[PDB]
Amino acid sequence: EFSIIDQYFNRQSHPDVALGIGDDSALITPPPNQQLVICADTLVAGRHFPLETSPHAIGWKSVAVNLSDIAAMGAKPHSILLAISLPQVDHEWLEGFSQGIYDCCNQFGVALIGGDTTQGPHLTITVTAMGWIETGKAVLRSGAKVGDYVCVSGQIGDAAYGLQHLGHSLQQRLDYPTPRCKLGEELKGLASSMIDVSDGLAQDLGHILKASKVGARLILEKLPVDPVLQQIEEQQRWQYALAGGDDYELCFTITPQNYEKLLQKQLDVKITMIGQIVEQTKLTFEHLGSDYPLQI
Amino acid sequence: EFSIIDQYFNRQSHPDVALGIGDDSALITPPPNQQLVICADTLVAGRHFPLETSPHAIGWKSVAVNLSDIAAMGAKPHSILLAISLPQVDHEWLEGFSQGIYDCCNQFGVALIGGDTTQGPHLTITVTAMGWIETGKAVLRSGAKVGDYVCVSGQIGDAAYGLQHLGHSLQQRLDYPTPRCKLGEELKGLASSMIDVSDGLAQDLGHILKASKVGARLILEKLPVDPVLQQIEEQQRWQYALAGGDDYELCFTITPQNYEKLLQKQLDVKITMIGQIVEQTKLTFEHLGSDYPLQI
Ligand SMILES: Nc1ncnc2c1ncn2[C@@H]1O[C@H](COP(=O)(O)OP(=O)(O)NP(=O)(O)O)[C@@H](O)[C@H]1O
Ligand SMILES: Nc1ncnc2c1ncn2[C@@H]1O[C@H](COP(=O)(O)OP(=O)(O)NP(=O)(O)O)[C@@H](O)[C@H]1O
Ligand SMILES: [Cl-]
Ligand SMILES: [Cl-]
Ligand SMILES: [K+]
Ligand SMILES: [K+]
Ligand SMILES: [K+]
Ligand SMILES: [K+]
Ligand SMILES: [Mg+2]
Ligand SMILES: [Mg+2]
Ligand SMILES: [Mg+2]
Ligand SMILES: [Mg+2]
Ligand SMILES: [Mg+2]
Ligand SMILES: [Mg+2]
């Protein structure tokens, strides 16, 4: 177990880490005039990923889903803790898994600074992520105002389709979600509210609506879906997009004025306006310019 | 699961929390001139606690073992995240478990500011603890010097005895360890090195010896054991004390000069000098003034 840490999880720490792996706790010197942003998310084998998922993909997604919650605040990710409960000690598995962890960390300039390694009957992983943001400038789930656009990044429904069609190209969106870190940072001071879409667009937008004490009207034909989902029947397409989940895209609200400023930035991801915030505290849908009753 | 969070894990925190439970991440405004101290430890049902352990004790210990690693740095604890994987939703269990979480947090002035709640086949808990310490003043596992006293707080072996004698009063030490938070803070500026005894005195002192590139000679009859263990045959007594684990006491090294200073403080726990640091890089034992060969 102590050898497991040294063998797989003790790459040299960044110069930006006061004390990394090796002691009872890690130490971080805060950057000035910034708040600590902190979150944790658990992945349970067979629940948050198929049992047969490659160890590298498990490692990647364990980090990615937590970076997504830092990004959903408009913050910049800094470091993570890794808590893993393992049924067995398998070198090939541990090599792939740790490679997955570090590949995702390195993509986004994040340090692995600590954690815990235990034995347990079922593979269970909890990553804690830490980031920093200019004091007072976090993008909350509250903050959405009547007249704001509702927007979402990338595509929604991919991962859900992937889960139900394993082996299909869209499985890559299930196994390797992309946390939208740079977009989150670019939305600081532009977005009036934000959440990452981890459970499903309707449910997660719903948290914003409830927190902001507003409602929204979405346009079904504007939901950004993969060409593959564009070719399946409407009803199923919209279910994948609205209740699929595991997208790890950012859903946010923004004034038309700030939206124009957003579109003028160089962004590493697609942005789509899918509706607007309204006064009535309900989530409703529009299609071809008419009300569209829809149960999700 | 959203009902669970609201019903059991959403009490108002200390004023020192910029944003607590309810958003994608929590926000903390760092106190000036302090470093973030951060750790995580997992408890797996049946492994880190007997399956029949009361939910209140499970909640208490989940927090306590993590406050212990904050204390082991000399730092002051501030807040925790709670990640729980639950096989079933049981109201009586959740009431007891959450009461245990909050009882430990409240005793030590700690806020529960976030976490994750999931379904899984086996009860698994990971708490992340966050604390703060004056920049540069952490007590590391490195730093022990030849001639330094080796010391330990409280009693060692209680929890291990309790585990093997479930039903005995010493089970209290297994179920309800006390993190030595105030002692940890009082050892800032005095201890030359420190670790908390979670795995066993010999093993955990061993991490200090390895990090400091020194050895130690312990005096077996000076080990602080319960009167109950004083009545056991000495070999088994010393095995509980040196290899029992789950003590969550602090083991630290300290100059004779600084030990005198320590004893002048008003402390909330027993402190015992049990040996001293030596040049040769080995852990050895002495009994009644003679070398005492002992395998842990
Ligand atoms: N999977 C992991 N990834 C990264 N760091 C880890 C991991 N597991 C453990 N660590 C780090 O390795 C060091 C030793 O960990 P550990 O033995 O769990 O310390 P501890 O909490 O003080 N003891 P214990 O309470 O018995 O678990 C610490 O600095 C941990 O933060
Ligand atoms: N057991 C818990 N104790 C304390 N806070 C919790 C707990 N579970 C969840 N929370 C908090 O409750 C809020 C909602 O949690 P959660 O639904 O897990 O958010 P999320 O990470 O954005 N979504 P997801 O990735 O699907 O898990 C967050 O502010 C969490 O930090
Ligand atoms: Cl273990
Ligand atoms: Cl779940
Ligand atoms: K730790
Ligand atoms: K947010
Ligand atoms: K979260
Ligand atoms: K330490
Ligand atoms: Mg420790
Ligand atoms: Mg999340
Ligand atoms: Mg640990
Ligand atoms: Mg989220
Ligand atoms: Mg520990
Ligand atoms: Mg979560």
Residue numbers in the entry:
A (entry chain B), B (entry chain A): 3 to 298
Please, what does the article write about this entry?
As part of the standard SSGCID pipeline, AbThiL was initially crystallized as apo protein and with AMPPNP/MgCl2. Diffraction was much better for nucleotide-bound protein. Initially, AbThiL was co-crystallized with 5 mM AMPPNP/MgCl2. Crystals from condition JCSG+ G10 (20% w/v PEG 2000MME, 150 mM NaBr) were cryoprotected in two steps with reservoir with 15% v/v ethylene glycol (EG), 5 mM AMPPNP/MgCl2 added, and vitrified by plunging them in liquid nitrogen. A strong anomalous signal for both sites (13.4 and 8.3 sigma) in the AMPPNP-bound structure was additional evidence for potassium, even though no potassium was added during crystallization. By comparison the anomalous density for the phosphorous atoms in AMPPNP is slightly weaker with 7.9 sigma. The anomalous scattering coefficient at CuKα radiation is twice as high for potassium as it is for phosphorous. All of the structures were well resolved: For the structures bound to the substrate/product pairs, residues Met1 or Ala2 through Phe304 or the C-terminal Ala305 could be modeled, while for the AMPPNP-bound structure residues Glu3 through Ile298 were modeled.
